[PDB]
Design a protein around this ligand. Structure first.
Ligand SMILES: CCCCCCCCCCCCCCCCCC(=O)OC[C@H](COP(=O)([O-])OCC(O)COP(=O)([O-])OC[C@@H](COC(=O)CCCCCCCCCCCCCCCCC)OC(=O)CCCCCCCCCCCCCCCCC)OC(=O)CCCCCCCCCCCCCCCCC
Ligand SMILES: CCCCCCCCCCCCCCCCCC(=O)OC[C@H](COP(=O)([O-])OCC(O)COP(=O)([O-])OC[C@@H](COC(=O)CCCCCCCCCCCCCCCCC)OC(=O)CCCCCCCCCCCCCCCCC)OC(=O)CCCCCCCCCCCCCCCCC
Ligand SMILES: CCCCCCCCCCCCCCCCCC(=O)OC[C@H](COP(=O)([O-])OCC[N+](C)(C)C)OC(=O)CCCCCCCCCCCCCCCCC
Ligand SMILES: CCCCCCCCCCCCCCCCCC(=O)OC[C@H](COP(=O)([O-])OCC[N+](C)(C)C)OC(=O)CCCCCCCCCCCCCCCCC
Ligand SMILES: CCCCCCCCCCCCCCCCCC(=O)OC[C@H](COP(=O)([O-])OCC[N+](C)(C)C)OC(=O)CCCCCCCCCCCCCCCCC
Ligand SMILES: CCCCCCCCCCCCCCCCCC(=O)OC[C@H](COP(=O)([O-])OCC[N+](C)(C)C)OC(=O)CCCCCCCCCCCCCCCCC
Ligand SMILES: CCCCCCCCCCCCCCCC(=O)OC[C@H](COP(=O)(O)O)OC(=O)CCCCCCCCCCCCCCC
Lengths: 713, 46, 72, 505, 63, 96
């Protein structure tokens, strides 16, 4: 009973068995059918020699025969089926199968072991295999199951356990998404995956659970996931020292996965599922402060609007199913043109089928994008914690309508109602949100109304009909809105949950990183000259159509909304950071104590600063990649699957003098507004006269500098 | 079931082949994905 | 920053300020099995995945893979 | 490959499960009557009440397992019977296979058993809902009402004969037998004092419809002397007779299956009845009426416009949905939800034997399970918090997290999320109604799924959320294992029944 | 009736296959063929997709 | 109310008799009499009230055996449907 002796005997037996296998294989090759003539020779000496020298083969065959006999008995017992092929007795069967050695003819122990070892070898995996089969599904399922199981098992996973588990899952998901983003956007790669036959929806119909990873899906998915990764990293610092941080983290993960499922939906049933899931998870995030009933009122407002949108979407899907006996998104997109000519007989009116379907879709899209009239819930949804607010308002909850329009664009291209309604409502919402945000005094409310304005601009861009411009606008707005939301969240946490900047002043020194990060993020968000966010508005005005009947109102509202960005950006930044100290004495004194002076001193989190920095860097890189893909001379974007060409790119490639000078009007309007917000004095100061003098110096120097640059050189 | 797309000629196919295009052909499931594969069952046992 | 900590009843199974000593092993035994489950789901679903042709490939209209209309 | 063995196994299982239940009930009753001079509980650990509870529970459960097996056998049998009829086209060949009865047990009431998918769905609902309700009524049965432990076994036997009979008179008698046990339960087991009047309202309101159905049955039997339920193919009712029969049948069965304005009794009984018996009532006892209406109206040929009946059903749905908001009582709110769902189900049966019946059956199953879930949640709230009123109950989630989670997931399921038989049934009904009358479909969907849904969600969310600062010395602990697993099983069924074979749906 | 619905489901699946295989360019050109005519010919009057009843005369049922 | 017997014989109740001790000397003329039973429940160490504390393999084995039986039964059913004693595995399988 020695382990060393057992191992040595096992190794010796392995070598003997391998040698016997090789010998039998060679002899079998030589004597395919005549091997028995020598193996089973009647000679006693030869029989004994063969048995002794092939004992490992014989014992292995005996064990295999016993195992096969027992397995066949078990199968017969369980299935009440047949016999062991034949009714051979136990003795006859075992003797025959043990004497038979042909089972080893193609078997080599070393080769088999090597195959088993190399089966798990990871060197083999290649990009080509990944390109053939998408690993995005494997990582998304990982993230989903991690979130679900973490929700269920909270006691097992403490604060740190939940954070680390979900961080690993989300990082893997984001890296895979990043890998496939390059292929889908430019290389014309898209996948249609099916998990199975989900449900039966008619007498003989059964819809499968399918996902569509296309350019339209990936544009939203990658943006949401990239924003969510850094929001997740930031939340652990924002909700620092809170009773319930795991709950908030898991709610954020749930909302992210719900939005990902919605955007990457293969059929209307999955789309509706994702729609309801984002609604429910947004409700939970808004109602996070469950103890308070004041929060429940805002949550219930959002819930009612979401249920109305669900009604509209469900009715539209029912109309589509009744018309075409199909719920597949691709099939519907490629079939809708045939049924365009059809009408539906309703109560007393014959409504055009496309018009009614597009009416319901646009209604639900407006409700979820917080357009004018249906936006009443968005200002009240700010009761959620800042990470949840950023995620919902950047690219997750308020872009659902934009995703719907982009995915079902072939439908709306043949919609008279869409043509009339999208530009008017978009421009009105843009103007309303911009002006209200400019006049707003609270940080979260300002960001919410700015989000409403940018959603209006997105609607107007879709009305223009350049899906590339819409996608660029969506990406820019989402990234920079999220970054600004994180910055204001740090500011609010420092200011002790007081979100109004009337009590904020001189925070530049107390939050140095937030000041500069907010400066960059706001100049990019509010379309300002010489910034990454100027081109989105420039392209929107390039593509704006002029055949509308309400074009005067549409254009005036668009101009006012576009200019409104400057006021809110300036007010937010200046009032928060560089205005006179208006906050309570405690806020400043508690942090100005000399004892706190240390290398570790900070009023924010190092992880939060790093998360914001990485978010800004990645947003810049991705926006540049999209700009190169679309706005470059060589068009390298993937197919959008739309046959409607707007001609808008003509005024981007070869603009005429008329349009070039027309854009200057808005440019100079913005310039005058900047001069007003900078040099305008509302309060007496020691620097009133010197401020007027500086304005005079700037005007005269600008004139002379222009003279020298243009003429004197 | 019957062909839906309009037909093309064998001469046109040969012209495309000379130009360097390839005929799309579905590929068999790899051993890892194939559910009737020794690799698949070794993975299951592991 | 956060709210002041207050006592939570022992009998009540709630998540207020819950931290687990064995969170490392808990995470280890909650991550890898989930990864294996997702791998199984992924390999099951890949059988029913569709991809368009590659860059140098064209679909022959008369090949079986090409779409076929219903024959009455 | 279908063989006669499967046919006979199906028939034998169906026939013998009934006798299994009957013998269990007979033995339990004999023990109960002959063990004590007076049939009341002896307040000690050695009472026969424990044995009777054990026998009832694990007779229902084992019969439910056998019913699963027999239902699967029936599905195979019906599918292969349809294949046998449809497949062969030769004129000389015809499927004429005759089966000989067993010599072990007799045919109850000398009737040959006939089973249908709707009947077996109804029987499965009976089993499951009866199991839940019996599990609920343990705290109510004490020392003088222990005789009502057999009420659910009696219900199961009545429903078994109801769904496994091809005789019109036996069908009607089984339908009418359900009144006595239910009335006795409400009268003697209900804690509240208003249950005394609620029971009388229930009896009178249901008996008016019972009399209407009795008049219809008398019209059918007196005119057609047949009772086989299939000889009606060879007899045609004139227009006047047919319209009278359909009106009587619809009104009579709508008295039981609540329709506007005949739901006053339902609201009263649900509010004032035992929390464990409300589950059984709403889940099952209102669907025997739907099954009977389906059978009668599909057997009779009707040449009348169903617009009036559709209008009645839609008015009931609208009325219940609009009233949902104004209820602070959770039990009454769930009762209004039951009225809404039952009216939708009844509307699903207004087009004769069209494909609407499939959606109606699926919606009946999902409503049974959903109503059981909702009434069980209300029962848990009332039993641990000694009130079922929104003003007195607030912040359930923060003291009983599992109960609050159950409420939230119940609301999500009630909303009709995809992946649930609730969503599937809504899809069936609305897809049909869109083509039948699109504007009516829009109005129905709008009302039910927005206004009624918001009214329903307001009270439940207000109860779940908030801050329970009142009566801190009397706060409960949490759900028990029994309650938690009942809730989990309801969720599991609502989710997984969507994978049931689509052949019958 | 189930068989006609199956025809509609099959043609819808073929349209999805065409959409995935063929790029948006020439997709409508290739669809304006047997496939589009069959899609229109399998509309609601001819196949009962999800309607409660397929309104058929006795002659249509016999056919 | 409950009428079951507390003192079961299937096993001995875990208990600790040292937490509470009964006074037996030094009484006063105003002090109440001590208590006779002072045993408290003692839980097994490493018992976690927040989970099921289930350490058996019976459920897992039952589920795995059910799944394996379902797999083999489906294999046999497919062979019967194809009219063969066993599955005829093809040389190549494609996506579908
Ligand atoms: C407190 C509850 C309150 C409830 C009431 C309130 C309800 C409403 C509110 C809800 C929210 C509040 C409650 C939640 C908090 C609870 C807190 C708590 O109690 O903590 C302790 C609780 C228990 O852990 P523990 O106390 O530490 O230890 C328990 C024992 O040690 C474990 O002992 P063991 O290791 O021996 O395990 C025993 C067994 C567990 O035994 C059971 O649970 C018996 C189940 C019998 C069948 C019943 C139907 C099952 C339907 C599917 C769902 C499976 C159950 C998972 C839970 C539901 C989903 C989340 O484990 C298994 O083997 C799992 C496999 C189960 C599969 C069975 C499938 C049957 C057929 C189903 C239909 C056909 C499917 C075809 C699929 C085809 C291929 C895709 O915390 C958890 O661990 C949570 C687990 C959550 C589920 C995930 C893990 C299982 C995954 C199974 C496979 C599915 C995943 C993907 C597979 C992909 C490949 C196929
Ligand atoms: C959106 C809504 C979301 C809602 C959900 C949110 C998430 C909720 C999460 C929390 C709740 C769920 C997860 C946790 C559940 C609890 C897990 C747990 O561990 O609890 C511990 C829990 C409490 O532990 P305990 O107090 O110790 O109680 C132990 C049990 O009494 C018994 O334990 P045991 O150790 O005594 O094991 C007993 C076992 C005994 O196990 C065994 O016997 C297996 C080993 C022997 C194999 C046979 C060998 C024969 C030859 C002898 C060989 C030598 C001896 C070998 C054995 C040696 C000993 C090991 O017997 C059985 O299990 C009988 C089953 C038999 C029928 C089914 C399986 C067979 C199918 C057919 C097979 C055909 C082929 C085979 C043929 C065989 C020849 C005829 O125990 C259990 O896990 C029991 C199972 C049921 C637990 C509750 C399950 C609830 C599931 C809820 C699902 C809800 C789904 C909702 C989906 C909604 C979707 C929208
Ligand atoms: C008539 C010519 C055709 C154009 C028609 C339109 C005329 C111009 C209309 C401009 C409306 C701007 C509204 C901004 C509201 C900002 C509100 C806010 O945030 O608080 C105040 C913030 C300051 O916020 P604050 O926080 O620093 O202090 C606020 C102090 N209290 C509250 C006391 C007021 O910004 C401003 O004060 C600047 C706005 C006032 C000055 C407006 C000058 C307009 C110059 C127009 C130039 C036109 C150029 C020619 C071409 C135009 C057409 C192409
Ligand atoms: C086979 C494939 C995989 C099978 C897995 C099936 C999973 C089915 C769904 C499981 C849901 C589990 C919920 C657990 C909730 C635990 C309690 C909790 O979180 O705290 C409650 C909190 C606080 O709880 P607490 O701290 O008082 O108590 C925790 C401990 N207990 C409950 C045990 C006492 O209360 C609330 O405010 C309610 C919040 C509910 C939030 C629910 C969000 C769910 C989001 C899921 C997103 C999934 C996306 C899916 C995408 C794909 C869709 C096709
Ligand atoms: C003409 C023929 C007439 C036949 C009449 C039938 C007479 C029935 C008499 C019932 C007596 C019940 C008490 C027996 C003594 C129990 C002793 C005990 O508890 O020790 C534990 C021992 C053994 O326990 P154990 O620990 O070995 O657990 C294993 C249990 N068995 C053996 C069943 C697998 O006795 C029992 O557990 C028996 C429990 C009996 C009660 C069962 C209740 C469920 C419903 C069935 C009741 C009977 C109705 C008929 C069958 C159903 C319909 C087909
Ligand atoms: C809703 C009321 C409150 C709730 C209680 C319910 C009570 C009413 C229940 C429904 C009764 C039937 C009403 C619809 C009848 C439709 C057919 C019809 O009459 O049209 C003329 C019919 C149909 O005619 P037709 O024009 O269609 O075709 C035949 C034409 N001729 C004859 C000329 C060839 O004509 C008749 O033959 C007259 C029949 C009159 C029958 C009226 C009495 C019915 C008595 C039995 C039921 C009593 C129930 C009482 C319950 C207790 C009340 C408190
Ligand atoms: C560019 C992506 C960047 C992000 C990647 C994140 C990680 C993704 C997960 C790893 C890849 C999995 C898919 C493999 C595809 C494939 O089969 O690729 C094919 C190769 C073999 O090549 P061939 O099939 O072509 O011959 O597969 C293998 O070699 C299988 C070996 C295992 C691979 C990792 C399995 C991960 C699942 C969990 C394992 C848990 C182990 C036990 C823990 C206790």
């Amino acid at each position: 009973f020695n382990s060393i002796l057992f191992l040595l005997f096992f190794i010796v037996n392995l070598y003997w068995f391998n040698s016997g296998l090789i010998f039998f294989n060679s002899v079998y090759k030589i004597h395919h059918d005549a091997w028995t003539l020598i193996f089973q020779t009647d000679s006693i000496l030869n029989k004994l020699k063969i048995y002794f020298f092939l004992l490992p083969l014989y014992i292995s065959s005996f064990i295999h025969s016993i195992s096969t006999w027992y397995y066949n008995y078990i199968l017969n017992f369980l299935l009440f089926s047949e016999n062991l092929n034949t009714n051979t007795n136990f003795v006859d069967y075992i003797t025959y199968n043990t004497l038979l050695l042909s089972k080893f003819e193609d078997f080599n122990l070393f080769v088999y072991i090597k195959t088993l070892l190399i089966t798990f070898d990871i060197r083999q995996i290649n990009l080509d295999f990944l390109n053939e089969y998408p690993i995005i599904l494997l990582t998304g399922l990982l993230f989903l199951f991690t979130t679900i199981f973490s929700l269920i098992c909270l006691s097992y996973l403490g604060l740190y356990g939940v954070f680390i588990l979900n961080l690993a899952s989300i990082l893997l998901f984001w890296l895979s998404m990043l890998y496939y983003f390059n292929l889908i956007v430019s290389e014309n790669y898209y996948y249609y995956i099916s998990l199975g036959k989900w449900m039966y929806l008619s007498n003989g119909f059964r819809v499968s659970f399918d996902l569509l990873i296309d350019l339209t899906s990936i544009s939203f998915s990658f943006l949401t996931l990239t924003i969510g990764v850094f929001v997740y990293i930031y939340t652990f610092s924002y909700f620092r020292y809170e009773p319930l941080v795991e709950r908030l983290i898991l709610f954020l993960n749930s909302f992210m996965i719900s939005m990902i499922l919605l955007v990457s939906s293969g059929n209307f049933i999955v789309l509706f599922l994702g729609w309801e899931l984002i609604g429910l998870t947004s409700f939970f995030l808004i109602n996070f402060w469950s103890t308070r009933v004041g929060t429940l009122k805002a949550a219930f407002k959002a819930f009612s609007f979401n249920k109305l949108s669900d009604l509209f979407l469900f009715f539209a899907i029912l109309i589509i199913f009744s018309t075409t006996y199909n719920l597949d998104i691709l099939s519907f997109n490629n079939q809708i043109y045939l049924y365009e000519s059809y009408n539906i007989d309703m109560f007393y009116w014959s409504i055009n089928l496309i018009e009614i379907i597009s009416f319901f879709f646009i209604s639900c899209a407006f409700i979820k994008s917080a357009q004018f009239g249906a936006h009443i819930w968005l200002p009240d949804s700010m009761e959620a914690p800042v990470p949840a607010s950023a995620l919902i308002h950047s690219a997750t909850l308020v872009s659902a309508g934009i995703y719907l329009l982009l995915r079902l664009s072939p439908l709306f291209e043949l919609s008279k109602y869409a043509y009339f309604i999208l530009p008017l409502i978009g421009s009105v919402t843009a103007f309303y949100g911009g002006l209200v945000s400019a006049f707003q005094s609270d940080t979260k409310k300002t960001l919410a109304y700015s989000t409403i304005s940018h959603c209006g601009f997105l609607m107007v861009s879709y009305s223009t009909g350049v899906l590339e411009f819409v996608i660029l606008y969506l990406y820019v707005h989402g990234f920079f809105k999220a970054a600004t939301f994180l910055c204001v969240g740090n500011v609010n946490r420092f200011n002790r949950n007081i979100q109004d900047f009337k009590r904020m002043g001189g925070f530049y020194k107390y939050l140095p990183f937030e000041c500069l990060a907010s400066f960059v993020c706001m100049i990019n968000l509010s379309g300002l000259p010489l910034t990454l966010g100027f081109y989105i508005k420039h392209l929107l005005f390039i593509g704006l159509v002029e055949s509308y009947t309400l074009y005067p109102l549409i254009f005036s509202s668009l101009i006012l909304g576009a200019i409104a960005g400057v006021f809110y950006s300036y007010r937010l930044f200046y009032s928060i950071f560089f205005d006179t100290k208006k906050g309570k004495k405690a806020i400043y004194l508690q942090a100005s104590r000399i004892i706190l002076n240390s290398k570790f001193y900070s009023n924010t989190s190092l992880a939060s600063n790093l998360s914001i920095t990485f978010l800004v860097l990645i947003s810049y890189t991705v926006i540049l990649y999209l700009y190169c893909t679309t706005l470059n001379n060589y068009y390298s974007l993937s197919d959008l699957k739309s046959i409607y060409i707007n001609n808008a790119y003509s005024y981007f490639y070869k603009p005429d003098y008329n349009f070039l000078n027309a854009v200057s009007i808005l440019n100079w309007f913005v310039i005058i507004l900047l001069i007003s917000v900078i040099y305008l004095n509302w309060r007496w100061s020691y620097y009133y006269t010197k401020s007027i003098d500086s304005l005079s110096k700037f005007i005269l120097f600008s004139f002379f500098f222009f003279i020298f640059s243009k003429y004197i050189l | 079931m019957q062909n839906a797309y309009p037909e093309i000629t064998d001469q046109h196919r040969e012209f495309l082949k000379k130009q360097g295009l390839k005929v799309y052909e579905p590929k068999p499931l790899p051993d890892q994905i194939n559910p009737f594969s020794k690799t698949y069952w070794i993975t299951n046992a592991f | 920053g956060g709210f002041q900590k207050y006592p939570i009843p022992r009998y009540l199974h709630v998540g207020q300020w819950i931290v687990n000593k064995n969170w490392k092993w808990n995470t280890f035994h909650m991550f890898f099995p989930t990864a294996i489950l997702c791998f199984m789901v992924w390999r099951n679903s890949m059988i029913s995945t569709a991809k368009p042709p590659n860059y140098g490939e064209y679909v022959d209209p008369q090949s079986p893979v090409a779409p076929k209309a219903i024959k009455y | 490959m279908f063989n006669l063995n499967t046919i006979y196994l199906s028939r034998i299982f169906i026939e013998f499960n009934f006798y299994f239940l009957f013998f269990l009930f007979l033995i339990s009753s004999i023990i109960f009557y002959f063990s004590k001079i007076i049939s009341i509980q002896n307040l000690n650990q050695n009472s026969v009440f424990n044995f009777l509870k054990l026998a009832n529970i694990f007779g229902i459960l084992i019969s439910f397992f056998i019913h699963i097996i027999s239902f699967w056998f029936y599905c195979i049998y019906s599918y292969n019977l349809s294949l046998n009829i449809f497949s062969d086209i030769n004129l000389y060949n015809s499927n004429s296979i005759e089966l000989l009865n067993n010599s072990l047990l007799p045919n109850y009431f000398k009737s040959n058993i006939t089973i249908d998918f709707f009947g077996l769905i109804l029987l499965t609902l009976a089993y499951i809902v009866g199991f839940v309700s019996i599990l609920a009524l343990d705290t109510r049965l004490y020392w003088k009402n222990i005789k009502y432990i057999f009420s659910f076994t009696i219900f199961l036997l009545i429903v078994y004969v109801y769904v496994t009979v091809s005789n019109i008179l036996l069908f009607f008698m089984c339908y009418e037998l359900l009144l006595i046990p239910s009335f006795l339960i409400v009268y003697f087991v209900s804690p509240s004092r208003r249950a005394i009047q609620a029971s009388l309202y229930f009896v009178i309101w249901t008996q008016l419809g019972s009399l209407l159905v009795l008049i219809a049955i008398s019209y059918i039997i007196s005119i057609t002397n047949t009772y086989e339920f299939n000889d009606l193919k060879y007899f045609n009712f004139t227009n006047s007779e047919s319209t009278i029969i359909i009106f009587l049948i619809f009104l009579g069965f709508g008295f039981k299956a609540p329709i506007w304005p005949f739901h006053y009794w339902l609201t009263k009984t649900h509010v004032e009845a035992p929390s464990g018996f409300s589950i059984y009532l709403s889940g099952f006892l209102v669907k025997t009426a739907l099954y009977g209406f389906y059978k009668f109206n599909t057997s009779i040929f009707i040449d009348i416009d169903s617009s009036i009946f559709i209008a009645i059903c839609i008015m009931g749905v609208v009325d219940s949905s609009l009233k949902m908001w104004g209820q602070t009582d959770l039990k009454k709110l769930v009762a209004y939800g039951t009225i809404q769902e039952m009216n939708i189900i009844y509307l699903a049966f207004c087009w004769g034997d069209s494909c609407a019946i499939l959606g109606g059956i699926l919606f009946s199953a999902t409503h049974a399970f959903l109503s059981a879930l909702m009434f069980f949640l209300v029962d848990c709230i009332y039993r641990r918090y000694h009130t079922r009123s929104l003003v007195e109950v607030n912040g359930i989630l923060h003291i009983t997290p599992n109960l609050g989670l159950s409420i939230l997931f119940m609301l999500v399921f009630f909303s009709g999320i995809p992946g649930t038989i609730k969503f599937i049934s809504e899809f069936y009904i609305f897809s049909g109604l869109l083509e039948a009358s699109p504007f009516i479909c829009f109005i129905l969907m709008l009302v039910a799924n927005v206004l009624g849904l918001i009214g329903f969600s307001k009270s439940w969310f207000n109860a779940t959320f908030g801050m329970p600062k009142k009566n801190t010395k009397y706060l409960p602990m949490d759900l028990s294992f029994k309650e938690s697993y009942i809730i989990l099983y309801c969720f599991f069924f609502l989710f997984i029944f969507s994978y049931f074979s689509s052949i019958f749906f | 009736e189930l068989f006609l619905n199956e025809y509609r489901k099959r043609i819808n699946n073929e349209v999805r296959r065409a959409a995935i295989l063929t790029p948006t360019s020439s997709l409508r050109e290739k669809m304006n063929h047997k496939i589009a005519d069959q899609i229109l010919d399998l509309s609601s009057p001819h196949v009962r997709g999800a309607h409660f009843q397929a309104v058929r005369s006795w002659t249509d049922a016999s056919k | 109310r409950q009428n079951f017997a507390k003192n079961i014989t299937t096993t001995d109740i875990p208990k600790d008799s040292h937490h509470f001790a009964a006074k037996r000397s030094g009484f006063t003329q105003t002090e109440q009499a001590p208590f006779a039973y002072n045993d408290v429940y003692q839980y097994p160490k490493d018992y976690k009230p927040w989970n099921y504390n289930y350490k058996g393999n019976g459920v897992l084995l039952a589920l795995f055996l059910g799944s394996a039986f379902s797999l083999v039964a489906y294999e046999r059913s497919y062979a019967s449907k194809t009219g063969r004693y066993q599955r005829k595995v093809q040389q190549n399988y494609y996506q579908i």
